[PDB]
C-alpha cells in the first residue's frame, strides 16, 4: 500500500462520501452527522444518477446519437412514471 482507501472506495462508490458528509454538516441539518449517513445518501444519489443516465443514454443511441442532450433527458424522465413523479417536468 502507499495511500489509504477513501471512504467512497470502501463503500464501492463513485460519488464522494467525504464531501457529502461535509455538505450535510455545512447545511446545519443537525447537531451531528454520523459516518453512516453520507455513505447511504451518496449511494442513493449514485443509484438515481445511474438509472436516469441509463434511460437517457438509450434514447440517444436509439436516435443514432453519441451524445446525450436535454431532449433525451426530458424524454427519459417524462416517459418513466416514477422518475417523472420524483424529478418533475424537464423544460428546455
Amino acid at each position: 500500500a502507499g495511500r489509504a482507501k477513501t471512504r467512497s472506495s470502501r463503500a464501492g462508490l463513485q460519488f464522494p462520501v467525504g464531501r457529502v458528509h461535509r455538505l450535510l454538516r455545512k447545511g446545519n441539518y443537525a447537531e451531528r452527522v454520523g459516518a453512516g449517513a453520507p455513505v447511504y445518501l451518496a449511494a442513493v444519489l449514485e443509484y438515481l444518477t445511474a438509472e436516469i443516465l441509463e434511460l437517457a443514454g438509450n434514447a440517444a443511441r436509439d436516435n443514432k446519437k453519441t451524445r446525450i442532450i436535454p431532449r433525451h433527458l426530458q424524454l427519459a424522465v417524462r416517459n418513466d412514471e416514477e422518475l417523472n413523479k420524483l424529478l418533475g417536468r424537464v423544460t428546455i
Binding site: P16, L41, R67
Partner: protein
C-alpha cells in the same frame, strides 16, 4: 532530486559586469544581508558576503524567462529568473530566483535611477545570453488584474509570454504556451467576483487557481484569454479539478471524444457533482457522452434530491428527539420521498453500500 547543471564558466580577463546591493529570494540560510550579481560567459552568479560558499550559479541555458519589473509604481525593483529545471537552494529547491532592492518629488530621481540601473543590467544578461535566445520580458501594466493565487490579494500581470506575480512570495509564473484550457467559475448574475482556473497540457500537473477576481475585470480577463489564443469556458459552480484531472489523465482520448473540457460546465450554494455524473455515465454507457446543458440538468437533479432527503432527515431527527442524523433517518426519508419501486431499490443500494463499508 534535480537536473544536473554544467559548471559556470567565469570571466577572469576583466572585472565582470556587476549589480551591487541586491537581496535574493528565496532567502538563504543566515542573516539577511545584501549581495551582488555578476555576469559571466555561461551564466550569472549571485554572491553573499557572509562566505565565499554562499552563492548561486545560474546558467543562461536554464533560464526560461527573464522578467524586469520597475518600481515606478511599487516599493521594490526586481529582476526575476524563472528556470526550465529547478535547482538546489541550500536545503530546498527552487524554480525561481529573483534579485531586488528596496526604495526607501525627491524620490522621483532615486526611483527612476534605480530602474535604469536594473533595466540595463537585465539587458546585459540577455545580451550575454543571446546564444540561448534570452530576452527581457516585462509586465504589461495596463492589462493587470487583482486576484488570490494563495492567501492575499495581489495584482496579476500579463507579459509577452506569461502571466505573473513576482512582487511578493509565493511567486506565480504561468507560461501561456503550457496552457490547455481556462475555466471561469462562480460566473453568475450578479457576481461580485469569480475564480479563474488554468489547466495545463501536461495533465499530471496540478491546475492553478486564481481566486476572487473582481467582476469589473471579467471582460478584460476574457479578452486576454482570447488574445492569447487560450480557449475557455465559464459557469456558476466550482469544479472538482483534482478528481477531473485524474479521470482525464487515465483515458484522455475518450474524454475528448465525449466533448472535452466544455461539458463539465458551460452556462454562458450549489455543488458540482459533474465529474461523478460522468464517472457513472462511463459505467453505464462507456461510449456515450453528455452535453453541457444536459450535464447541468443532471447536476440540478442531484442537488435537488440531496436537499430534499437531507431536509426530511433533519425533520425526522427533530421529531424523534435525536440530535444526530444517521443512516436510519436517511433511509426513512428516502422511503417517504421516493416512489415505491424506485424507493425499494434505492433503500437496497444504500443498505448494500453501508454493509460493504462497515465490513471493511
Amino acid at each position: 532530486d534535480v537536473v544536473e547543471q554544467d559548471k559556470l564558466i567565469e570571466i577572469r580577463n576583466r572585472r565582470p559586469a556587476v549589480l551591487d546591493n541586491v537581496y535574493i529570494r528565496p532567502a538563504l540560510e543566515g542573516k539577511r544581508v545584501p549581495g551582488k550579481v555578476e555576469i559571466h560567459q555561461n551564466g550569472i552568479r549571485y554572491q553573499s558576503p557572509l562566505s565565499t560558499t554562499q552563492r548561486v550559479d545560474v546558467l543562461f541555458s536554464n533560464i526560461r524567462h527573464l522578467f524586469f519589473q520597475p518600481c515606478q509604481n511599487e516599493m521594490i525593483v526586481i529582476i526575476h529568473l524563472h528556470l526550465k529545471d529547478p535547482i538546489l537552494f541550500g536545503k530546498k529547491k527552487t524554480k525561481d530566483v529573483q534579485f531586488y532592492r528596496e526604495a526607501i518629488q525627491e524620490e522621483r530621481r532615486r526611483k527612476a535611477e534605480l530602474d535604469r540601473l536594473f533595466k540595463s543590467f537585465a539587458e546585459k544578461i540577455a545580451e550575454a545570453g543571446r546564444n540561448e535566445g534570452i530576452e527581457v520580458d516585462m509586465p504589461i501594466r495596463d492589462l493587470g488584474f487583482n486576484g488570490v493565487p494563495n492567501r492575499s490579494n495581489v495584482v496579476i500581470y500579463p507579459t509577452t509570454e506569461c502571466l505573473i506575480q513576482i512582487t511578493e512570495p509565493p511567486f506565480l509564473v504561468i507560461t501561456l504556451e503550457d496552457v490547455e484550457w481556462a475555466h471561469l467559475e462562480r460566473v453568475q448574475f450578479g457576481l461580485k467576483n469569480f475564480d479563474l482556473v488554468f489547466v495545463f497540457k501536461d495533465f499530471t500537473r496540478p491546475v492553478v487557481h486564481i481566486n476572487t477576481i473582481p467582476v469589473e475585470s471579467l471582460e478584460d480577463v476574457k479578452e486576454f484569454l482570447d488574445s492569447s489564443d487560450i480557449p475557455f469556458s465559464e459557469g456558476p459552480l466550482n469544479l472538482n479539478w483534482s478528481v477531473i484531472m485524474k479521470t482525464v489523465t487515465a483515458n484522455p482520448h475518450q474524454f475528448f471524444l465525449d466533448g472535452g473540457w466544455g461539458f463539465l460546465q458551460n452556462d454562458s450554494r450549489k455543488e458540482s457533482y459533474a465529474i461523478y455524473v460522468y464517472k457513472v455515465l462511463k459505467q453505464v454507457h462507456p461510449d456515450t457522452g453528455i452535453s453541457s446543458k444536459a450535464m447541468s440538468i443532471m447536476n440540478s437533479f442531484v442537488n435537488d434530491v440531496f436537499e430534499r432527503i437531507a431536509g426530511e432527515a433533519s425533520r425526522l431527527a427533530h421529531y424523534n428527539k435525536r440530535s444526530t442524523i444517521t443512516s436510519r433517518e436517511i433511509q426513512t426519508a428516502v422511503r417517504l420521498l421516493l416512489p415505491g419501486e424506485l424507493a425499494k431499490h434505492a433503500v437496497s443500494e444504500g443498505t448494500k453500500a453501508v454493509t460493504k463499508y462497515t465490513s471493511a
